[PDB]
Design a protein around this nucleic acid. Sequence first.
RNA 1: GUCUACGGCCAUACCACCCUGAACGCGCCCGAUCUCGUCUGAUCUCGGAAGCUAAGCAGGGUCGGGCCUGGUUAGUACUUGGAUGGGAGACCGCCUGGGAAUACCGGGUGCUGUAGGCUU
RNA 2: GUUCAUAGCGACGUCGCUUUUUGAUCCUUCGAUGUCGGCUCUUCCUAUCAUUGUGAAGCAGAAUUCACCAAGCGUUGGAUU
RNA 3: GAAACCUCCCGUGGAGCAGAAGGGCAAAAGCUCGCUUGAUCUUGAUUUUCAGUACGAAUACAGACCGUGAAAGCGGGGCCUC
RNA 4: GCCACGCAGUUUUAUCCGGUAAAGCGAAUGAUUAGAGGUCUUGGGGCCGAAACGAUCUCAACCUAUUCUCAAACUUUAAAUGGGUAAGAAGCCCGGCUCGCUGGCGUGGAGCCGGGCGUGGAAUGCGAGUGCCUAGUGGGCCACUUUUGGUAAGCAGAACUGGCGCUGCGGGAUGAACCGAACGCCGGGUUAAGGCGCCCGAUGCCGACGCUCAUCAGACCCCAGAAAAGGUGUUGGUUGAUAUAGACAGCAGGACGGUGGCCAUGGAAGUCGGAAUCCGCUAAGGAGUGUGUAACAACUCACCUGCCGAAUCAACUAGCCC
Lengths: 159, 168, 175, 213
Amino acid sequence: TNTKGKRRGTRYMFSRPFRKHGVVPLATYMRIYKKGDIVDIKGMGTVQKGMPHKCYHGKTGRVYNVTQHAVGIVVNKQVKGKILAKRINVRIEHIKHSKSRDSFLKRVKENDQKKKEAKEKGTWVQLKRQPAPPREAHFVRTNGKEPELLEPIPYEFMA
Amino acid sequence: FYVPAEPKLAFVIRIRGINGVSPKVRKVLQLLRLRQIFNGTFVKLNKASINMLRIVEPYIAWGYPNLKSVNELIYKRGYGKINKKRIALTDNALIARSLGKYGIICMEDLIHEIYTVGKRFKEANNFLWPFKLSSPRGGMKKKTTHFVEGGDAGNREDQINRLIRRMN
Amino acid sequence: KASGTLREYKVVGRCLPTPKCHTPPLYRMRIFAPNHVVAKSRFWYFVSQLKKMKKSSGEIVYCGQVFEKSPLRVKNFGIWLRYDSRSGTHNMYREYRDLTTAGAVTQCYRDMGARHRARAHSIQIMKVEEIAASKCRRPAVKQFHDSKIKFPLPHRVLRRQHKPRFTTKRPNTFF
Amino acid sequence: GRRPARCYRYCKNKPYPKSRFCRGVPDAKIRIFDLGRKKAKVDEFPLGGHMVSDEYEQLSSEALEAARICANKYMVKSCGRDGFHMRVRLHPFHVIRINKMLSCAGADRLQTGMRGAFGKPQGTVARVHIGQVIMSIRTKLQNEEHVIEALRRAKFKFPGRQKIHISKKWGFTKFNADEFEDMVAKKCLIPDGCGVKYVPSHGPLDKWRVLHS
RNA sequence: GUCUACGGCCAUACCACCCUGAACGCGCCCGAUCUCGUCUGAUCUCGGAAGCUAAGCAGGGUCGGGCCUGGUUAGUACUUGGAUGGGAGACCGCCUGGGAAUACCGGGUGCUGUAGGCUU
RNA sequence: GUUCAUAGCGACGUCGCUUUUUGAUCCUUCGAUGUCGGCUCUUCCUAUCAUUGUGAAGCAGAAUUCACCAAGCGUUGGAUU
RNA sequence: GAAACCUCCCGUGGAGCAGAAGGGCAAAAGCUCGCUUGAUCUUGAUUUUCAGUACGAAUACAGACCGUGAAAGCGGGGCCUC
RNA sequence: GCCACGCAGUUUUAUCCGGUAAAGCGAAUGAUUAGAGGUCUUGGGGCCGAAACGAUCUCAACCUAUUCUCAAACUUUAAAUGGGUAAGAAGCCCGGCUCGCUGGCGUGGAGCCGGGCGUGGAAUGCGAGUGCCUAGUGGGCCACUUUUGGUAAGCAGAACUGGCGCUGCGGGAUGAACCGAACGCCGGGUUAAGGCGCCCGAUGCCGACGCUCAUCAGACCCCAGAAAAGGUGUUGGUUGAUAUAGACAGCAGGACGGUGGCCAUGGAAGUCGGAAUCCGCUAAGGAGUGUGUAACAACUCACCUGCCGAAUCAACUAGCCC
Ligand SMILES: [Mg+2]
Ligand SMILES: [Mg+2]
Ligand SMILES: [Mg+2]
Ligand SMILES: [Mg+2]
Ligand SMILES: [Mg+2]
Ligand SMILES: [Mg+2]
Ligand SMILES: [Mg+2]
Ligand SMILES: [Mg+2]
Ligand SMILES: [Mg+2]
Ligand SMILES: [Mg+2]
Ligand SMILES: [Mg+2]
Ligand SMILES: [Mg+2]
Ligand SMILES: [Mg+2]
Ligand SMILES: [Mg+2]
Ligand SMILES: [Mg+2]
Ligand SMILES: [Mg+2]
Ligand SMILES: [Mg+2]
Ligand SMILES: [Mg+2]
Ligand SMILES: [Mg+2]
Ligand SMILES: [Mg+2]
Ligand SMILES: [Mg+2]
Ligand SMILES: [Mg+2]
Ligand SMILES: [Mg+2]
Ligand SMILES: [Mg+2]
Ligand SMILES: [Mg+2]
């Protein structure tokens, strides 16, 4: 009984944030997108051309094609019990770079720097990041102060 | 006050059966290698493993084993996964042929690596087949509720040793 | 929380140090629990209610059993508590006579269960205090403040009713 | 022609206000929410007594009207017509519907049963939560027992369980009675009508110097 | 320490009123032959340089409004998972983790890129 | 209810019970459970009309009304349909 | 004159954008002018429903021929969802 | 240092996405309660203002600051759970070449060719990838939780997971779905859920502490029957009060004068009603809590006093029982 409209249910999804209507800031147009880099699809509603479908809002894909105003993105979409890599053309207003990829490339560069430096200076260093370890043993000083005694408060109806 | 180091080794025992299990709990139990009730596994404790234990909290009883518990578990019920087969650890050569490249060549080396979580704890622990423990002699309190509310599920700090003594 | 014979635990905890306070304050509570695991759980429950603390955001620096300093002396205990009834929350002050504080609190838990059908998860023990015999308010406790207390055991029911199960003589209740 | 209130006691549906979608709603039974000397100043009636529900349920507009009438009659009888002020703190904003069936000996007469069963607006009820105030009475400090008795009598007109609570606030204000006097003395509060205006220590100094003058 | 041209983020930058402004500048200002538009040289376009910081503009001020950021609200509301927990129900409590928002009370009131000036 | 809330009633509200009404549903029955009423006959229920024993009254008597224990016993002859 | 026109001031849009509603929009996407026919000729790819079939609708390109503007550009119908 | 191609209904670490729960309405849009303060008007008007409402009194509308209560088709703010991506050898870094695309530029982009880097760059687990042919099915139902219609339904319709269907076994006496647990044929040991008077295995413990008497007692998830309202039954608890300056309860007195107070009147004299609550005697007395008298009258109460000599009273609250 649901309609199959392209923008059904996008009332808040494609709406602008509070007090952020009007002219689109130009740094979004000034961003550079190469083939192979990772972008997040958002889909602002001020620009009605090149809009992604509502199923790609919030998804992340890889750029494979660059045109004058849009990019081609390979983004995974789950349909029933299969995931297929859809290719969508999205204008650059509706995308932004992925800071997850940015941080990963930064970490790779920093790890390569550490490898070179540590091979230069001999001593082995850890590069694989570990999960949070159990807390080590330590001493807690009282500083000559008795810890405060806490008791539950009596009940009373307030309002 | 001297706060001891947070324990880095846990023993996890699956206490509930295999009927009517939600998919996430089922997956995490499979990743912990607890596919049967009263199966035990040593788990190296960190943020990821602790969060997995929190996910499967109603289905398991876990705690911090001591040296005696590790010794009893390895010696009485220790089986190796040698060539994908469950082989009883009746000889030191069985351990040496599978773990000697890591320096573990005997029952004592295996027990040391399990107890003091060493560099090759993952290899030493995965070499061990999950322990097939008996039913708890003397019974349980209540398997359907948490330990801190009078039951058996969840994290009992060091009463897992009492549970192990009754369990194997 | 189930029960047994409860024990008193001094539990001291604090928040984990953060780059806002390097030495967070230490907080101490008296927890009456079956064991130290339940004691730590109840400590976290109470400090979460009172301060803005969590088990994950803090740590417990001490948890030790408090032995009774005079278990060979009968004494009067006043217990201030609060509990949730079926239709509200109430504050109660109760009195018991016992040798140990933990035994008095166990008596309180059993008595609340008996008289008000209050389960131990509904009960919050907020103060336990040894009180003088002249400060007692409950007549069932005050009637034992007699230097010349004297009473018999009137109607002694046979408890060995199955050893023997069959006999010729009918039991005597007067002794 | 009204159904028993047991058929609409519980908050089973989503809130269904009288709006541009729900049209044709009959007017609520209760139209007056404030009674007694409403023009009395704040210091005139220092004592406030609330009646507080203990159940999450729906109170009908007719029930609110009946409770208001009962409390008003007892308060007028006891404390006089100018010795109290009552405020009903519940408004019947939730429309309850009825799927009307024909009460005749026939189902062939286009009854249709459960087909197209969405109902027509029957009435309006107020949704009340646990701990929410239903009625409030402010009066002199010596009429506390009369307020308690009036609210106790009004309790019998409602389905669930209600408690009578003598609030610590001064009258209908949100400020504690013990702090009210010295707050008015230091001019943190300015009386107007039945309420007080809180005067914070920020803003233009012209508003500060019109006070203290 | 500032300004101008072009900006990036788009109120910590806005709004109301008041005070101050050296030198460049930006302006207000003067005029309609040409260029160009008008009901109207008001606007736009053009040609200027007598006067003025009155205004714009810049800086500052206001127990200022707003905005931004904190505290409180509050481990409250709400919530993942659990129980052969309670209750006639409505609902509620506990265990295991996560965790808000008003009112109220504080602090702040643009940062900065390129190019070019002024400031002894 | 001449006064008097509650002898007897009970507005506005609100809580229930019953399955002797009519609905709602469609779980059983469509290789079929004979579908209304009357007649006949037995048994059961009590939310008691009468009768037995009681309490109350705006119970003087008489009559009546309200309520309790209570289903032992009875609850009819006819015109029209 | 309460509403005719003229003037100033305030005015974040509380108007308008054909229609239902929602989103979007201010030297806009609204109003008024000027010039026009990109509502034209073509091949593929893609999104939406989806079985990843079709139709319909839509998005980004590419090749012609054009319109407009000083130009950057924009335009192959209607601001988007029928 | 080193121990497989690769994968995952899982976590961790980064990084985005969202508008539900909650919250808000002295924030927009709608709905909505009550006062307060102001000053213009085709508000009513207002008593002596026509005369310049000489005046200014009230009620409107309006504005301002507050105030009560709300929203599935409202929202500034905004969770939990959740959805996507990344966590390297297809990577990183050096050079060099090609281009008809782009272009101030040896520019940008893409491709291609050599070379060097292994600490294999979170945890945990698991061996993966791929093709062909293909049956049956396409009536479902149930439970926790979320949820729409309906008074409700063993009703109708959705979301999530599990189950029954397709499944036996232990327990719930009995039972498609509940709880435990899933199954080759057996011996021994131990448990789960549930139990241990007898049926019927197991408390034939010298079990612990209390609560409860029912002339319809009560007795264990689903579940197989009950509510509002009451109780001077009993047990706890909260708040308040009185008391050797003698409480409480009983027994016995006074309970007045003005004043048989005023306006109600046909009697209402304290009590058929409206207002106000005086004074003094003091031991106290309401110019009255009730009975009643046609009305008087006569009683009672709250108030005090006498006898009595130690504790007592009230209102709530929630357990079992009624
Ligand atoms: Mg199960
Ligand atoms: Mg045994
Ligand atoms: Mg379960
Ligand atoms: Mg009826
Ligand atoms: Mg509904
Ligand atoms: Mg300010
Ligand atoms: Mg919680
Ligand atoms: Mg009358
Ligand atoms: Mg037949
Ligand atoms: Mg037959
Ligand atoms: Mg009867
Ligand atoms: Mg073209
Ligand atoms: Mg278009
Ligand atoms: Mg939505
Ligand atoms: Mg809400
Ligand atoms: Mg609003
Ligand atoms: Mg159904
Ligand atoms: Mg079948
Ligand atoms: Mg199956
Ligand atoms: Mg089965
Ligand atoms: Mg069975
Ligand atoms: Mg049964
Ligand atoms: Mg056996
Ligand atoms: Mg049995
Ligand atoms: Mg037996």
